[PDB]
Amino acid sequence: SVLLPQLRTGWHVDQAIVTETKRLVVIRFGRKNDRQCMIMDELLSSIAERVRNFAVIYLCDIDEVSDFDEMYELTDPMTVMFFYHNKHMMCDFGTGNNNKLNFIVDDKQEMIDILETIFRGARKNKGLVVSPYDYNHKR
RNA sequence: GUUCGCGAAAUUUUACUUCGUGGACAUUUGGUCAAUUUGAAACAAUACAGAAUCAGCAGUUCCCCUGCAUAAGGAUGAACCGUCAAAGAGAUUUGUUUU
């Protein structure tokens, strides 16, 4: 958890998205007290060093910044989201919501494969990517 | 209350109509192509998932064979033997077989 930096204003979020051209921007929207928010914080905290080349991971709190709540429709304790060149990325996970992310991923390798596949499909301008894993038993 | 099935009646055995009877009798979600159009905001155009394959040499790493170099190291053969050159001056001797 301490490994990943946190974004304390909406402008740190926005500039974090704008100033980074060549690698994905991954934000976890959620609060420190939640049960599901710390788990993806640990999972993403282990993965950050492997992936630092082709992606970077940041942290955002909903109570700290409530500005994006209505715009991206943030519900559930946590939503992970993926941004490439200011463009919100999108991938059909089988969860029925191709936007953002909700559930807690299990294995490191499955999440690194999601990051890798979203990245690779993102370099081609492709809006929708198809994950190798449809988890929809979860949602 | 809806259908399927069996028994009874009114008529031409199956058929309609009604009685006695055995089941079956929920709705949704997980279902978005991406890319592009100077405006009070709609899915209307514009694409439309088409969103290179055989062969050759060389080069790094080790091994062997054969050359040439270099550093060291060895083995053996080779018939004949070492304390000047020129010019000038002085001193001593010099009848017949092989010319």
From Swiss-Prot:
It is found in: Nucleus. This is Spliceosomal protein DIB1. The keyword Signal does not apply. One of its GO terms (cellular component) is nucleus. It comes from Saccharomyces cerevisiae (strain ATCC 204508 / S288c). Component of the U4/U6-U5 tri-snRNP complex composed of the U4, U6 and U5 snRNAs and at least PRP3, PRP4, PRP6, PRP8, PRP18, PRP31, PRP38, SNU13, SNU23, SNU66, SNU114, SPP381, SMB1, SMD1, SMD2, SMD3, SMX2, SMX3, LSM2, LSM3, LSM4, LSM5, LSM6, LSM7, LSM8, BRR2 and DIB1. One of its GO terms (biological process) is mRNA splicing, via spliceosome. InterPro entries: Dim1, Thioredoxin-like_sf. Essential role in pre-mRNA splicing. Also essential for entry into mitosis (G2/M progression) as well as for chromosome segregation during mitosis. Keywords: Acetylation, mRNA processing, mRNA splicing, Nucleus. It comes from the Eukaryota. Belongs to the DIM1 family.
